[PDB]
Each structure stands twice: as C-alpha cells, then as structure tokens.
Amino acid sequence: HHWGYGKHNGPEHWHKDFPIAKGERQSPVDIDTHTAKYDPSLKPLSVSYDQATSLRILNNGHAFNVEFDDSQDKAVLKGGPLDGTYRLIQFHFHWGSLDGQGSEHTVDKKKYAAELHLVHWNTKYGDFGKAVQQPDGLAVLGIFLKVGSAKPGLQKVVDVLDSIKTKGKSADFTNFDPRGLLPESLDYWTYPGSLTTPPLLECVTWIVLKEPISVSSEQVLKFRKLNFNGEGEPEELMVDNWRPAQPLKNRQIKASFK
Ligand SMILES: [Zn+2]
C-alpha cells in the first residue's frame, strides 16, 4: 500500500508515512499575486543549459523523469534568490485528467493544465542525496503549462512516452535540450518550500516563473496515456499526479518583478 494519488493513498494520506506532510514549509502553495512583494535585491535568474547532457527517461510510477548527467558543472541554475550553484539532475511534470487542473502551484487560485519542475541540487553538498538533507539543498524551477499552441521543444519528450508506458520502464534519451522548454521571460516568484512528493523534505528554494509556456492539447493528451501501474497490471492512467496547495504558514513569497 504505497503512496500515490488515489482515493486511498493520495495526498491526504501522506502524512501517515511522512509526518513532515503537515510541516511548516510544505509545497506547493497558492501564489497570491497581490501579497507577493516585489524585492529589488533579487537578481536575474541565471539558467545555463547549453552544455546539458540528458541520459534517460524513466516512468517511476508517479511521473516521468528526464534525467541528466550531473557529474560535472554542465547545466546550472544560479543567481535569482540563490547563493551558489545548483546542478540540474532531472525534470518532470504534473498534469491533470482535464485541461482545467494539473498544476501544483496556483496563481490567485488559478490552476494550469500542467507544471514542469526542473530539479537542481546545491553543488556545495556534493550530490543530490546529501543535498536533500539541507534546508538550501535544492533549487526547483517551476514552469506552468497552458493548452494552446504546441511547444516544439517538448515534442521529442512526448514522442518517447509510448516506450515508457508503465511503471519501471526507462528509455535512452540523449541530446535533449531543456532550453526548448523555457518561456521568454525569467520573471519569477520565490519562497522556501519542500519536495511535493514523498519524502516531502523541506529542502527546496522554489523559483516559479510568471510566464507559462503553451503546449498543444495533443501534447498533453499523450501525457495522459501514461500508466501508474506496471506492465501486466490493471491499467490506471497516470493523470492528476499533482499535490494540492498547502498552507503558507506566514512564509513570504517574493516577486522578482513589479
Ligand atoms: Zn514535481
């Protein structure tokens, strides 16, 4: 009876195995755009992905992760609210069963069709495993997806999904360039929070871009053909793999922009 997103194991149940689910800096959260204060000391975000090396795409039973070689300083996030340099380890998405839901963060209670998470770890902790044990161990860049025009840079991801339909399947996935997933603007909101899946560790500086990217209905439809189950098990479509907004608890959300 492992955690997931169903009626009997979904986000409302997580606190039983992961008591930090009711902690002081849980994610995601609703971004109240009227109370997020502009902070002119926040720096431009620096996203250096030109040397990114993707290796593999994996269905882990909760999402698909596109994984990167993080054994050298190749694809780093820095600047913004961060001190130091954070190395990209993987990205993944959360999405809905319908276009009207799917994002984890919300913006004045608005839910987007999906949300992309580019996960980075603080190089001063040596690796991802040690970083998640630190309050500033991770920097996660969150990007909202709305349904409209296709995102051409997403199409190589969408097209390999039939090869990792079920939990546990992986596929070679080299030379994918994540710069094809970024909006024009790097204006962002930022706040201290957590992983949004178990173990829900409170190790993340969240950086959520104000500008969503557009993906086509056909692109998000193919996300929804994935499976939570493993091969040869009853088919359960991987949809609504999103945790809802959690209490802000007096944390302040800061805006990079006026
Ligand atoms: Zn995520």
Author numbering: 3 to 125, 127 to 261
Authors' text:
Here, we show that fluorinated amino acids can be easily incorporated in proteins expressed in human cells by employing a medium switch strategy. This straightforward approach allows the incorporation of different fluorinated amino acids in the protein of interest, reaching fluorination efficiencies up to 60%, as confirmed by mass spectrometry and X-ray crystallography. We tested this approach on a set of soluble human proteins: α-synuclein (αSYN), copper-zinc superoxide dismutase (SOD1), carbonic anhydrase isoform 2 (CA2), the deglycase DJ-1, the N-terminal domain of heat shock protein 90 (Nt-HSP90), and the SOD-like domain of the copper chaperone for SOD (CCS-D2).
To evaluate the impact of FAA incorporation on protein structure, which could negatively affect the significance of 19F NMR data for drug screening applications, we determined the structure of 6FW-CA2 by X-ray crystallography. The protein was purified from human cells after a 24 h ST expression protocol and subsequently crystallized. The 3D structure of 6FW-CA2 is perfectly superimposable with those already deposited in the PDB and shares the same space group and cell parameters (backbone RMSD 0.21 Å). The occupancy values of the fluorine atoms computed during refinement ranged from 0.4 to 0.6, in good agreement with the percentage of 6FW incorporation obtained by MS. Therefore, the incorporation of 6FW at up to seven positions in the CA2 polypeptide does not significantly affect any structural features of the protein, making 6FW-CA2 amenable for protein–ligand interaction studies by 19F in-cell NMR. In contrast, a 24 h ST gave rise to the highest yields, even though the incorporation efficiency was <50% for both proteins. Remarkably, 6FW incorporation allowed distinguishing CA2 bound to different ligands, as the signal at −119.3 ppm either shifted to −119.0 ppm, broadened, or split into three separated peaks when 6FW-CA2 interacted with ETZ, MZA, or AAZ, respectively.
